[PDB]
Amino acid sequence: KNSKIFSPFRIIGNVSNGVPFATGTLGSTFYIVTCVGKTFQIYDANTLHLLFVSEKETPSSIVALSAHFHYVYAAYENKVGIYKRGIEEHLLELETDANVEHLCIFGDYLCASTDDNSIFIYKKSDPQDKYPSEFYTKLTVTEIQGGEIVSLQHLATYLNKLTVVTKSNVLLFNVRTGKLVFTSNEFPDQITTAEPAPVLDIIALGTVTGEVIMFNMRKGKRIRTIKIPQSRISSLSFRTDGSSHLSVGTSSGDLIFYDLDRRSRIHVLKNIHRESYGGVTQATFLNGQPIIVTSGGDNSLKEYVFDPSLSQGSGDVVVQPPRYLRSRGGHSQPPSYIAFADSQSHFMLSASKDRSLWSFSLRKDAQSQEMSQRLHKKQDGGRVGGSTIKSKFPEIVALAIENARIGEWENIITAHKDEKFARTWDM
Amino acid sequence: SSLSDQLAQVASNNATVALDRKRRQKLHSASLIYNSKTAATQDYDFIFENASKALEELSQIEPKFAIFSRTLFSESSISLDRNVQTKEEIKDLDNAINAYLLLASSKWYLAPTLHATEWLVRRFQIHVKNTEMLLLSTLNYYQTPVFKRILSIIKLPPLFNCLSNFVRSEKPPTALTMIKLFNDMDFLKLYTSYLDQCIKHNATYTNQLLFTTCCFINVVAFNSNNDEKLNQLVPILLEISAKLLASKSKDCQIAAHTILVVFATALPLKKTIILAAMETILSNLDAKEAKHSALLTICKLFQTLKGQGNVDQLPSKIFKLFDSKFDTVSILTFLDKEDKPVCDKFITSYTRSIARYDRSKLNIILSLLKKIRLERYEVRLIITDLIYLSEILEDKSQLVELFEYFISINEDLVLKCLKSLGL
Amino acid sequence: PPPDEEEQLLAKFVFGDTTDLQENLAKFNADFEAAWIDSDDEKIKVPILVTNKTKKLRTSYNESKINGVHYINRLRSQFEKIYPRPKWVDDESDSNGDINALTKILSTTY
């Protein structure tokens, strides 16, 4: 179905489609690889400029994403792609009929997980080789060990050990042996998220109910337990900057910053992502930085920061609340109508079904500005017949724009759905 | 960062080091008692002699200062310097100075304490190195020339910007600006940590506690509109109340009662939170005046809360704790008091709890009902649970006597309840 | 010959000795096993001098290989050098009416 005139290039105005992103670094440059359906992008995190984008589409949507140093590991319908700067360079077809559900990488061992509880371990062809290509082995977890595979992690300082967190317990698999070396005890609550703490041998498990279990593998024991009820825990992160703060992102779209030393709730952020689209699908501290990147499923990606404390002596007791820092976003729904703002092809207006007009840049995606809806005061200065609370206009069914006199009066006219008047907009 | 900001940082790091005669005359002229000229012209041995006399006076007052005579008030304490010492010794100095300010927070009307603190200021530079502990210490004396002098000579950390307005004027700081200081949120966390240190060292007093509670009540009154601000101000004040109840002194318990009462009548809390507050109060209740104010507090809290499950019965543990720490004759004479505060929902829940659990003191129940003027839905609830208790328990003469009392007062309600449930 | 006590006092006074104050300050205080092992993880031996990070991990110039348990102990010590071990995970673990039920409800509700 390929053409002789056109060719797909990229996608404007998308930051995430709900699949949890992955952070990584190249020395000073911190990057964030985020999926958009069949095509991922790689953002910077120092300034959130776009850095790379996958030039070739995947035939289906990407299911899993990971990224160590200079390689991005995508997992769509059956295969794993090892890509470099968005250029696909190694495909890896699994020898099954299932779909790849989880993925991790450590040392010379890629570890994928297909939904019928089937783990695949891949070895690099050389210790100095860059990506695992050779198929090492395949393991399976039947139902006597645990439930469905929820997550794969690799704890630090574990020679060829892989931590498999299922819905019921926590297993340790040695891939050099291909053997389950240690199964943990049973938890009455189904586990949803896992996170390797920067402390040794300890993983945090967020369950379906409000339980954050700090569990140690060496003792095989629940060291600590934090109770948040009426909440499904959806993301966990640890401040590695030099303080003991935990970030719990619950699927009602909330963030809670806990202090583990004083056993306190430092702060809570309400509705940083839309609850209807899953809420906070990932919250992640930057490694060694007081900056948390929070992505939702509503095509929104924010970055918050922690200021230094104002108290000279106390500090960690008098900790500052999280300041909002930079962000990108898009539409919740698909856009309804689009137009080009000028002959230079720099900006594009797009109105969607979510009752919102947005002007996107084209060059580098740093300028995805929502167009405000803040009414101008009338020249008469009289009263307007309207309610007490603001609410966005209905969806835009037609649009027209000119640039012959921009910045001297209005130059966009938008016709809304089921509305007996069209609005003007200043560009 | 901008180079001006980085040089400001290095100035704040080398703040207390005198690198010329002018900066030395500044750091030495800043004094607590003497003015600028004589403060500049006098000397360390003069100051230390006055310090030793003032502190032996203070040890005569109370024997706690002898350790500071041993370690902070010696001739080697003349000889040393802050900056030439290492980081560990700096931290140890700050710990000793915080202990001393915590101790001398309570005698600020005494010229001996003023003289000892003058020595500490002009030798160890507390008014430059650690101003937060000193200001949290002497905040409650905000209408005193000592506090005005501290405000004139101090360098202000960024939280005390209202006092930064009030520097070098001639009027004391106002109650309104004290309210603004405590109305800032992070300053409340600062003062929370300070009160926690004060509690864990068990050195609190009536004037400090009174100023604390008056500021807190005025703060929640100033925030009596913003429900988001009230909700995010719940954990601070309620945690201060929790640890102030964990303390043992009757002053701390009455201050916690006051904060709890005003908070629960300014913002409608949850039933579980009010039951938890009642549980901690009943657990740590010890003394007579604390008992009196605590009974008034439970009255106020149950009079505030209102919802589905308003007058339901107390749980087993809370009810047993209440009848342990309180007697029927005491609650009876409290009802017999002349003021008669509105114990409607509280007496209703207490009566239903007694009727479920004990089923013995029904004459005491009758005395409560005859003493208090009840309310219609509460009497309806009482009659329904009494119907259930009559049908479960064996029939009692005092039980049918309570029924006859209802015949005296509104038999028709008993008829409506019995026709909804029974004959 | 050791010094006398009174001449030690005189020496302190003359030289301006402050270590007695220093000890008073530093002594001042407010008076008022595992679950699993692995045989191949024990008996595994890895090379050492083949890369710079493990040449950093080692301790002896002439050693070239070490077994798995010592290798992983050196690795854990390096990981500790990276991330300092915190008190919340070191010194704390969970395992008539009370006084902190109010605090527990304050913890459990927003």
């Binding site: 911190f30 120092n46 930085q289 | 209202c162 | -």
Partner: peptide, 28 residues
């Protein structure tokens, strides 16, 4: 004057890290 809560630029400094390729090692 109320308390100033000024914002300032954030600088993402260098981040040391742990090596999973040092964790996974070959057998003897």
């Amino acid at each position: 004057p109320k308390v100033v809560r000024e914002a300032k630029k954030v600088e993402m400094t260098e981040a040391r890290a742990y090596n999973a390729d040092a964790d996974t090692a070959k057998a003897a």
